[PDB]
Amino acid sequence: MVRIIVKNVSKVFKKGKVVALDNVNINIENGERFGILGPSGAGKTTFMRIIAGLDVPSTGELYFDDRLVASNGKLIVPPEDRKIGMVFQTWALYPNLTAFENIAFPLTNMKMSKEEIRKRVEEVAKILDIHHVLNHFPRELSGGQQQRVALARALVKDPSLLLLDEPFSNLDARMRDSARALVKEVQSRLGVTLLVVSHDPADIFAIADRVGVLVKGKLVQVGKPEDLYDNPVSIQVASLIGEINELEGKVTNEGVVIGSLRFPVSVSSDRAIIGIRPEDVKLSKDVIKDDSWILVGKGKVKVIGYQGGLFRITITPLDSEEEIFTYSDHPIHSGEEVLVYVRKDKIKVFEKN
Numbered sequence: 001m002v003r004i005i006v007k008n009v010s011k012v013f014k015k016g017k018v019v020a021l022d023n024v025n026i027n028i029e030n031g032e033r034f035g036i037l038g039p040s041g042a043g044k045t046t047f048m049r050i051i052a053g054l055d056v057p058s059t060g061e062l063y064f065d066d067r068l069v070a071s072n073g074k075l076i077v078p079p080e081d082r083k084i085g086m087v088f089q090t091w092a093l094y095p096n097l098t099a100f101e102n103i104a105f106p107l108t109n110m111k112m113s114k115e116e117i118r119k120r121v122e123e124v125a126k127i128l129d130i131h132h133v134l135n136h137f138p139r140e141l142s143g144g145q146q147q148r149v150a151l152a153r154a155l156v157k158d159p160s161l162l163l164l165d166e167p168f169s170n171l172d173a174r175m176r177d178s179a180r181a182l183v184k185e186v187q188s189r190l191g192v193t194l195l196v197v198s199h200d201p202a203d204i205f206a207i208a209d210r211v212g213v214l215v216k217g218k219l220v221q222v223g224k225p226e227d228l229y230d231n232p233v234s235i236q237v238a239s240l241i242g243e244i245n246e247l248e249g250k251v252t253n254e255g256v257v258i259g260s261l262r263f264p265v266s267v268s269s270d271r272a273i274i275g276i277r278p279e280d281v282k283l284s285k286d287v288i289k290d291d292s293w294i295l296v297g298k299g300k301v302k303v304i305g306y307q308g309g310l311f312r313i314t315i316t317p318l319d320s321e322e323e324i325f326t327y328s329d330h331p332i333h334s335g336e337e338v339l340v341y342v343r344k345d346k347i348k349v350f351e352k353n
């Protein structure tokens with residue numbers, strides 16, 4: 001319901017010594033599901049707090065629709081006037097308050113009567129399917145129920161924007177799938193603009209329609225998840241969005257050489273970094289007669305693993321320590337020599353310089 005325009009936003013700490021965010025530019029569309037991915041310390045929470053209005057840009061401006069909300073160290077529209085709901089990385093339900101009281105809390109000074117408060121809480125409780133446990137204390141609720149109460153609390157003032165800072169971190173795995181689905185269902189039910197942050201890529205493919213990657217305070221790439229996956233601007237972005245094999249080779253007239261392997265791509269530097277995802281590699285004991293796979297050379301199996309019902313096969317080129325891993329329904333014993341094939345249009349190459 002609200003468009004977020006981030007114009008040249010920077011944020012410093014330690015009197016300037018630490019640049020948490022450096023000239024960030026992004027336009028998040030109204031009603032969009034937007035994700036931010038980046039390593040620990042990249043500036044995700046700092047970004048979220050600036051959007052929430054809990055902090056301000058040191059330089060630059062922030063607009064909600066055409067409304068200036070912060071500018072160069074000044075808060076123009078305070079958090080309480082921004083129509084935002086948040087579930088922060090270290091969110092906590094008040095242990096001594098029931099679910100009702102936890103959800104009602106944000107309404108205490110909103111000039112609404114007891115009846116108006118009850119009606120609003122029950123309404124959002126129904127949306128989150130926890131209307132039946134409103135009288136329970138948080139310790140009496142399941143993990144899923146707790147997450148629902150936290151969401152209801154963030155949605156009780158009818159916000160236009162919902163901010164989630166690493167929401168599915170306190171989850172095991174079965175719960176994560178469920179929690180991700182819930183976030184999507186309630187974003188649909190209310191139409192809110194949604195910003196979610198994480199150092200975990202699974203949440204991004206699950207929830208986000210567009211994603212921004214933050215590295216050391218810099219927004220290095222923005223695009224649809226599949227765009228970042230297939231066309232990463234760097235090997236670092238490549239690895240953040242998904243598994244990838246990273247190899248360093250010498251640039252040659254014929255291609256990039258890594259031991260006995262030769263990849264048919266080129267850059268400019270004398271050295272190159274090759275990125276190849278596991279699904280874009282295939283191993284074989286004989287030549288593959290398929291124009292969709294390209295032979296890059298011989299390899300030797302180093303070790304095999306077994307996870308997720310699949311075998312993880314790790315090989316190295318002849319005369320190299322560089323590893324390449326892939327997944328297969330069938331195993332190949334260590335020490336066996338194999339032909340290594342790749343999807344050519346899927347080879348990612350970057351300068352080492």
Ligand SMILES: Nc1ncnc2c1ncn2[C@@H]1O[C@H](COP(=O)(O)OP(=O)(O)NP(=O)(O)O)[C@@H](O)[C@H]1O
Nearest residue numbers: 013014018020039040041042043044045046047199
């Ligand atoms: N109040 C503060 N004072 C000083 N430094 C800060 C403050 N808040 C954040 N930082 C620093 O700014 C950088 C970004 O912090 P932060 O935005 O919290 O990263 P993050 O991406 O959320 N990390 P993580 O949650 O572990 O994935 C780090 O170098 C922090 O140490």
Ligand SMILES: [Mg+2]
Nearest residue numbers: 044045046089
């Ligand atoms: Mg954080």
